[PDB]
Design a protein around this ligand. Structure first.
Ligand code: ATP
Ligand code: ATP
Ligand code: BTN
Ligand code: BTN
Lengths: 235, 235
């Protein structure tokens, strides 16, 4: 009865009033490509390293099942599809979101959404958490806070699914296109710090052809970062 | 994204742009109680005895998985939950739905909805087809046709799920209550013909404590009908 007109993403949608995690459910269940798993609230929502992702009622918490018949080298760009999709949807609602490489979307430097891509066999799970009308952690923001009024959650869902379907269908044919859309919507030319054993600071210049973040250290040395479990912050 | 606040029915919802039959999917798949299977259209929708059920886009085609812990003798009353639920939803939209015993809902004697219950052990599937904005076959009508304008399909879905959840919750506690609601919303006091192995005509007087249709033949003979595979016709 939703009447979705998308081609792949959204051919089927499984909704839960409550779930542990849409990403976990998508990883452990046999689901056809394009299936969207969405829930009003998650009790065990997570980001990387099992980090807790606050998922109270009011936000958009979903995962999408994908099985990209593209070269192995291209699979790492799926996270960008989610990020750009969110930016496009925010724009439709007159909100200017900017991508914090490589999985976050910020509005005036406050985090409004996060993306988490996981694998299980040859299935890829694209998870997206977007703050809409829900309470958010201090420092973060939501569509409601930016617009000053409650936003119709289903309208946001319809918009995002439509944008992701378009981005994904093009990705299957032209996998390099997503990189320029990311570059034009990403926070660059600013100083950042990458943590971990041997942490360092430098200017985030761009992303390369593999989606790696290019950082120029004060010494002039250029490092290429693969997100993985690294921590990035704007100083 | 839906924000359903029901207790059992609607805890989970699986939506399909297209499906063979929501009843078949529900019967076949491993699903939790309360799960609603809904599709924009069905390619192989059916009623009893594999009779074709036209399910074009615009209508509400859904099935609900139930595992009612009530006496075996009460299970035949589940069809009434579907019929009454539909009537209540129609009344909420100011449409005069009346029950044609025991599985159909009519508006001005034209079929607007049909209920089909299929069971097997600890699993009952309550199927409901309601014409909303879709084109319908002759002898039928739709909400749009009766109101003279299109009706928001999602609004009808929310209304029906809420009514069904309430009716089901009460059914688990008092399986007899549904019979009073059927009596107050069913077409009675008119001549009908029962078509099965042979046939007979008489006045549809009421339904008894088992939900059987009580018919008074002209001779004065009283027959108690169990729907099963018989058909009821108005004269
Ligand atoms: N609803 C939310 N809105 C915004 N940020 C959230 C929300 N829930 C949790 N967070 C924050 O987001 C992080 C989520 O996990 P994850 O590591 O995947 O995000 P990240 O941005 O890539 O990493 P980082 O912790 O360095 O910001 C948590 O550590 C938490 O600080
Ligand atoms: N969209 C629709 N709206 C109304 N009626 C329909 C629709 N699609 C099919 N039908 C009719 O409904 C019937 C459905 O099957 P079923 O036997 O279960 O219903 P019934 O009302 O109990 O039987 P009967 O048609 O003999 O009175 C079909 O035989 C067909 O005539
Ligand atoms: O902060 C990030 O960048 C990652 C957060 C990803 C959150 C979404 S909410 C839908 C899905 N289910 C989860 O448990 N995580 C992801
Ligand atoms: O006419 C009747 O009384 C029965 C029709 C039941 C139709 C619904 S549509 C949703 C579900 N899926 C099916 O194939 N049949 C039922």
């Amino acid at each position: 009865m939703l009447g979705l007109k998308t081609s792949i993403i959204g051919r089927r949608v499984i909704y839960f009033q409550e779930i542990t995690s849409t990403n976990e459910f998508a990883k452990t269940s046999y689901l056809e490509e394009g299936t969207v798993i969405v829930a009003d609230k998650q009790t065990m929502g997570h980001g990387r390293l099992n980090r807790k992702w606050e998922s109270p009622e009011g936000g958009l918490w979903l995962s999408i099942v994908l099985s990209p018949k593209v070269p192995q080298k291209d699979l790492p760009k799926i996270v960008f599809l989610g990020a750009v999709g969110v930016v496009e949807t925010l724009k439709e609602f007159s909100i200017d979101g900017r991508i914090k490489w490589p999985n976050d979307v910020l509005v005036n430097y406050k985090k409004i959404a996060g993306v988490l891509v996981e694998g299980k066999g040859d299935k890829i799970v694209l998870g997206i958490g977007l703050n809409v009308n829900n309470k958010v952690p201090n420092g973060a923001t939501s569509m409601k806070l930016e617009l000053g009024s409650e936003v119709p959650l289903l309208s946001v869902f319809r918009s995002l699914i439509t944008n992701l379907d378009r981005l994904y269908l093009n990705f299957l044919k032209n996998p390099m296109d997503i990189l320029n859309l990311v570059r034009d919507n990403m926070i660059l030319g600013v100083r950042v710090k990458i943590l971990g054993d041997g942490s360092f600071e430098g200017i985030a210049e761009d992303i390369d052809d593999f989606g790696r973040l290019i950082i120029r250290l004060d010494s002039g040395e250029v490092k290429k970062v693969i997100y993985g479990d690294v921590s990035l912050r704007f100083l």
